[PDB]
Symmetry: C4
Subunit: 72 residues, 4 copies
């Protein structure tokens, strides 16, 4: 229920939006501006989505990919 | 069968690519793959098919990256 | 007392330096510190004094790095 | 007993030697050539020293720092 995403979705966080690159039963990769890869995002992902950061962090032209694991 | 089982040199088909086994031990494995594939779909494949979870580090090479995983069960 | 407790903006003395709190939530904290200190002595300090363990990522800034930690207990 | 190191020690691994930069009750930072930051080293640290990799990985002129946590 909490760890549920669909590829292509946009999610509001803080004063930005991150996008779902890939989502599976146990993993999710988001696209977000790198400066947001800090505690507030981690708390949001953990508390709202049962998701915890595992990496790696991959650089793209307008943001980074961050991969998270389901922690139910 | 033990799912966390790999052989150095093997190629494994994943998505539209093939990754290769660099090193494999009882509890760890390092694969070689294009960096763009170091995302959720690969993690799911490794977790579900091989009881393997990502620990890093991520090492750059001329034709891909090394990624190291640990056995989870 | 709850050991995993921090206030944005605070400086904390560690070794021969001072690190600063960038963000702090119930379960996560991001500190700003010189990169050379992202090693075992800092990890021990954070673990033992603050119930905090390193998760990353490590972000580069002009005068140091951001490091993110998770609450362990 | 297994997770026990002293700052400055040199440890033989494979065809190289790594050095202990720092060691505490629960953490150790080693200095090693980057190409060895792969499964064989992880198995050695895990099995011989009850140590598991947490990072970060820091670049120096002749190798990298890698930080590990005690996993007893």
């Amino acid at each position: 229920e909490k760890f549920k995403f669909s590829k292509g979705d946009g999610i509001k966080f803080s004063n930005t939006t991150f996008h779902i690159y890939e989502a599976t039963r146990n993993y999710v990769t988001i696209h977000i501006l790198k400066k947001y890869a800090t505690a507030e995002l981690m708390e949001f992902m953990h508390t709202r989505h049962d998701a915890v950061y595992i990496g790696p962090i991959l650089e793209w032209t307008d943001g980074v990919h961050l991969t998270f694991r389901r922690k139910s």
